[PDB]
């Protein structure tokens, strides 16, 4: 797997693996038992002619040509814990989300779906939330969380919005959402944010469709007056 | 515009303008959208051993 | 033709299921494949044997192999037992009765764990299939699922109504309400699989796949939403193999508690749980020794957290045995010792017993009491055999030579010997002659219940086939070594006499029952015959991709079948060699063949647990029969042909003896049935002042709404347009409704809005004809809450796109 001629070799970790230092400076650091290169090291851009283990391996000092030196530390265990933590963390957001929608507590349901970035969840906190506030625009807690959301965070909601706008089904939804965050947020940081001018594209016809239809359904009901009229008569 | 597929892998958004997170849906859900999907593309010697 | 009947099985002491242990050492519930054992620990007998009925082989049985009995549950108070199948059924025995009391089938795969509730009323059963589903004894119905884990149940624990904690084989560990029938918390227990998990109060202990060994304190009442399952600490077993079991005792005169953690391994590792004083005292004892190591606060307290899985634990003993360990059970506690009671793999149940005092065990290692090995053998039966008198079975396999009463099926005698091969009995069935693969030919006599000779150098490899001729006095033998020894008996001890040598393998040696033919079978996929009389060359036949496996010859010395790997049965004539025909019996490898005595119909066994029964002259399989559940490795017939013997990798022996509404009018009747509810429920308000909706369990005007929806687009303006005059009025009347409901019709807004103009231009000049005044009022009030609704949304629409096309100026000055 070397490109050039290999000048160094080390064992570490034991017999498990083998560290080879190239002409090419590359560190290439294999599996004994299976010949398989886990992890390649580029700290240099000239041959190397020496290599120095210690701790079987947990410290390794490689020397450039040009006189360079990588002090590489052993670091697997704290990766693997920190993959491990972020997994732990993961876990816990998703049933704190579903919980919180059996509860019904919405406002932080959005905080918890919009980080695990769950369309249905997300779609089914604004639906049914929206529900209930026909029984400012959503709620005073709600709102407010819309308002603390980050660039990043507003990039991703936008995009939902635009797809859930295409949809006569789904547009009332949208409609209101993009209404909380104009509201609750300064217009000219919005239009600063990269990709909000080609998201609000899509919007702009979508939504004049929309207003075009049910402008017409008001009409279609003063069918009622004539009956009122009529058969007042 | 018209919506389109998934930018993120781990995303199904259909032209109906919902997407759809392969975490949060269920075993049974992602079941019949991966056969809904298939309907989509369809039409579209030693002793001891041989002893033993 | 007459059918073959299963009459009985045997051989199996547990299989690979569980063990429950019952007070009277008491009694053993053990697992046999399909049927379960009742074992008396005391004795070493079975006591009662449970097996549902419909024999292998009945026309009403069916063809497929019976699903064997994975796990065992006994409710102690009640006297039931249950047990699951793998194939995801649950029968409930009565256990008196010795019959089936309820059947339950919701699992699409083999059951895991079964545990009754504390009152004996609800049943909890955990299968591969990743499912738990609580059954209800009394209601024989399911009561719900519960469906999040990812993988098979290896363990859960439910000591009250309210919750359940799950362990699946995706590595997570999972807390369920069982009120509202979800998950409440959620951990990933072990890196990869979660096999163990034992409660006891709050103190939780879960095993991974490695040694570790994880600590979780349980505050069920935290609700917090987090930490009602919080990890403590953890600690090393010395097992690096997986620990598949955990099980909690306590000891009443000393509220002692101790625990075992059943290893894939032969050991079973014990602990003891230290008490809050020892704890205590150690805890202050591990502080000066660090104190006085100067070690400073922060570090000594950071110490104990480190060290805090040793406070609470005590390695207390481990148990070793000669088998891998397939289950284990805590029998009984008590202050002067401690027993336990475990199956193995191979086939056999150990009793052990822990004396201790106080910390520590008084011995160095377990007491081994008890055993029942009698009635098993350890290592599959690799070869088996009649006796002329059809009265006694010797069954040679690895390790020992067991002989068993047909009859009575209890084995009467043992004979230590090698890794045997073949076995066969001699004339007068007073002896018995085995060939080892090491080369060993060992002869037995029962009688003197020993060895009478053994020759250590008759082969220089396996002695891979053994047969003898018609008269008794002449042994033919194949070996690896490449090569056919002919031997005599003279008063009893064997002698050499010839060596055929040949040019490869030998894989098996038949006489003719005339004793002129002799069938050879080599590893280069031919049978080679000769002429007994002389041992001159005779006929070489062809056809077998694979070396054959098994040999016979007609009772009249015409026909002989071959048997090979290649699944193929070929049917051949010693008057040319010419093949007759070639069968597809079996899927896998065919071990035996053999011809039924004075007829040309022949059995044959193979890999796939199939023995079939063939038509000699027809060449058509006459029966399936499906008993065994794994490799039937050996096959003999009696001599009177009145059954066939069969023992398999399973450990078996098994003995078989010779016996319409249209859409749019649905919405009428919808719309006025939840229309009645509405006066009704208007009714009993004036006052003040049906079966099918609660079924529904939804408003009339939801149901009704509901309905609408359902109705196709494409025939809703006709359905609304078959609408009659006098209950389109009605339909109005649930408009109404609708809109005091100002959410509903929020959310399903437009849907009605059409369906009413569309009513109002087909029946416009009906409406204006209705004088009613209180319909004008109902009319009124329809819009000014409808055009507030509907003028809210444009509003809502206005304000987006005015600001929305401001964004776009902006940007658009900015950037240009």
């Known amino acids: 797997g070397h490109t050039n001629a290999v000048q160094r070799c080390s064992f570490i970790n034991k017999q498990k693996q083998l560290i080879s230092c190239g002409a090419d400076g590359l560190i290439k650091i294999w599996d004994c038992s299976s010949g398989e290169c886990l992890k390649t090291l580029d700290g240099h851009n000239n041959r190397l002619w020496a290599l120095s283990t210690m701790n079987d391996g947990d410290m390794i000092v490689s020397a450039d040509a040009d006189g360079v030196f990588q002090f590489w530390k052993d670091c697997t265990e704290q990766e693997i814990e920190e993959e491990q933590e972020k997994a732990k963390l993961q876990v816990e957001q998703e049933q704190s989300l579903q919980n919180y929608m059996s509860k019904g507590d919405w406002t932080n349901a959005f905080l918890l779906a919009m980080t695990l970035d769950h369309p249905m969840r997300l779609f089914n906190v604004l639906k049914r939330a929206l529900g209930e506030s026909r029984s400012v625009i959503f709620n005073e807690e709600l709102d407010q969380a819309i308002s603390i959301l980050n660039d990043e965070q507003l990039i991703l909601l936008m995009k939902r919005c635009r797809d859930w706008n295409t949809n006569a089904k789904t547009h009332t ?22 990709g909000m001018v080609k998201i609000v594209d899509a919007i702009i016809p979508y939504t004049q469709r929309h207003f075009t239809r049910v402008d017409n359904l008001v009409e279609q009901s003063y069918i009622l007056d004539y009956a009122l009229v009529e058969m007042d008569k | 515009y018209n919506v389109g597929k998934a930018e993120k892998d781990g995303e199904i958004r259909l032209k109906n303008g919902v997407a759809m997170s392969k975490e949060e849906l269920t075993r049974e859900d992602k079941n019949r959208l991966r056969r809904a999907l298939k309907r989509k593309r369809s039409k579209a010697p030693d002793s001891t051993n041989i002893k033993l | 033709y007459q059918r073959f009947e299963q009459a009985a099985a045997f051989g199996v002491i547990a299989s690979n299921a569980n063990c429950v242990w019952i007070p009277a050492p008491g009694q053993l519930i053990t697992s046999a494949l399909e049927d379960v054992n009742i074992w008396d620990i005391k004795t070493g007998d079975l006591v009662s044997k449970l097996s549902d009925g419909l024999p292998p082989g009945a026309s009403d049985a069916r063809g497929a192999k019976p699903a064997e009995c994975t796990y065992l549950e006994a409710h102690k108070d009640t006297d039931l037992l249950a047990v699951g199948y793998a194939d995801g059924v649950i029968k409930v025995w009565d256990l008196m009765s010795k019959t089936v009391l309820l059947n339950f089938n919701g699992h699409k795969a083999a059951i895991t764990l079964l545990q009754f509730d504390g009152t004996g009323t609800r049943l909890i059963s955990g299968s591969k299939d990743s499912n738990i589903i609580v059954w209800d004894l009394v209601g024989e119905v399911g009561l719900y699922k519960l469906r999040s884990h990812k993988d098979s149940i290896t363990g859960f624990w439910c000591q009250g109504e309210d919750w359940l904690i799950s362990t699946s084989k995706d590595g997570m560990i999972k807390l369920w309400d069982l009120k509202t029938h979800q998950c409440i918390e959620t951990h990933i227990a072990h890196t990869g699989e979660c096999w163990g998990l034992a409660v006891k109060d709050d103190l939780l202990i879960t095993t991974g796949t490695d040694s570790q060994v994880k600590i979780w304190k349980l505050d069920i009442e935290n609700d917090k939403m987090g930490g009602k399952l919080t990890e403590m600490g953890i600690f090393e077993k010395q097992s690096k193999q997986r620990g598949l079991k955990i099980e909690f005792i306590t000891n009443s005169s000393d509220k002692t508690s101790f625990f075992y953690i059943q290893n894939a391994d032969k050991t079973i590792e014990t602990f003891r749980i230290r008490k809050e004083e020892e704890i205590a005292r150690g805890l202050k004892k591990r502080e000066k020794r660090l104190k006085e190591k100067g070690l400073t606060e922060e570090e000594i307290a950071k110490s104990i957290k480190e060290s805090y899985s040793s406070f609470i634990l005590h390695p207390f003993q481990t148990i070793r045995s000669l088998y891998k360990i397939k289950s284990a059970s805590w029998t009984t506690v008590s202050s002067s010792k401690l027993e336990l009671v475990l199956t193995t793999s191979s086939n056999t149940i150990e009793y052990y017993s822990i004396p201790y005092e106080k910390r520590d065990p008084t011995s160095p290692a377990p007491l081994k009491t008890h055993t029942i090995e009698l009635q098993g053998q350890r290592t599959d039966v690799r070869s088996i055999d009649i006796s002329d008198d059809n009265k006694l079975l010797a069954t040679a396999s690895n390790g020992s030579l067991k002989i068993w009463n047909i009859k009575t099926h209890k084995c009467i005698r043992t004979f230590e010997c090698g890794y045997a091969l073949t076995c066969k009995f001699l004339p007068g069935g007073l002896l018995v002659i085995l060939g080892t693969r090491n080369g060993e030919l060992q002869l037995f006599d029962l009688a003197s219940s020993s060895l009478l000779d053994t020759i250590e150098d ?72 000769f002429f007994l009389d002389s041992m001159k060359f005779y006929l070489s036949l062809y056809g077998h991709k694979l070396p054959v496996l098994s040999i016979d010859i007609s009772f ?13 049965i070929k049917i051949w004539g010693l008057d040319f060699g010419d093949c007759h025909k070639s069968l597809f019996a079996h899927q896998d490898s065919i071990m035996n063949v053999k011809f039924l005595p004075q007829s040309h119909n022949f059995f044959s066994c193979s890999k796939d647990a199939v023995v079939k029964y063939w038509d000699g002259e027809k060449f058509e399989c006459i029966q399936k029969l499906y008993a065994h559940q794994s490799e039937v490795w050996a096959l003999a017939v009696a001599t009177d042909g009145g059954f066939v013997v069969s023992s398999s990798h399973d450990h078996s022996i098994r003995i078989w003896e010779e016996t319409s509404l249209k859409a749019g009018e649905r919405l009428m009747e919808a719309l006025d049935l939840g229309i009645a509810e509405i006066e009704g429920l208007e009714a009993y308000n004036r006052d003040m002042k049906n079966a099918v909706l609660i079924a529904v369990n939804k408003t009339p005007e939801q149901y009704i709404m509901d309905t609408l929806l359902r109705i196709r687009m494409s025939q809703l303006e006709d359905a609304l347009m078959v609408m009659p005059f006098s209950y389109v009025l009605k339909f109005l009347k649930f408009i109404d409704t609708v809109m005091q409901n100002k959410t509903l019709l929020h959310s399903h807004l437009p849907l009605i809005c059409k369906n009413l103009f569309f009513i109002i231009k087909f029946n416009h000049k009906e409406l204006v004809s209705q004088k009613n005044e209180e319909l004008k009022l109902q009319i009124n009030r329809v819009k000014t809450e409808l055009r507030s609704a509907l003028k809210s949304t444009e509003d809502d629409l206005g304000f987006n796109v005015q600001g929305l096309k401001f964004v776009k100026q902006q940007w658009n000055l900015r950037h240009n």
């Open chain 1, 173 to 194: 939804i949208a409609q209101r959402t993009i209404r909380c965050i104009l509201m609750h947020h300064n217009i000219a940081k919005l239009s600063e944010i990269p």
């Open chain 3, 556 to 568: 009249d010395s015409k026909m002989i079948i071959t048997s090979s790997a290649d699944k193929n």
């Open chain 3, 458 to 529: 008759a082969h220089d490899a396996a002695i891979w086939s053994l047969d003898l001729t018609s008269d008794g006095k002449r042994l033919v033998t194949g070996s690896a070594d490449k090569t056919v020894k002919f031997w005599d008996f003279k008063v009893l001890k064997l002698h050499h006499d010839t060596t055929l040598e040949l040019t490869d393998d030998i894989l098996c040696v038949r006489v003719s029952p005339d004793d002129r033919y002799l069938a050879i079978s080599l590893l280069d996929n031919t049978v080679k015959v």
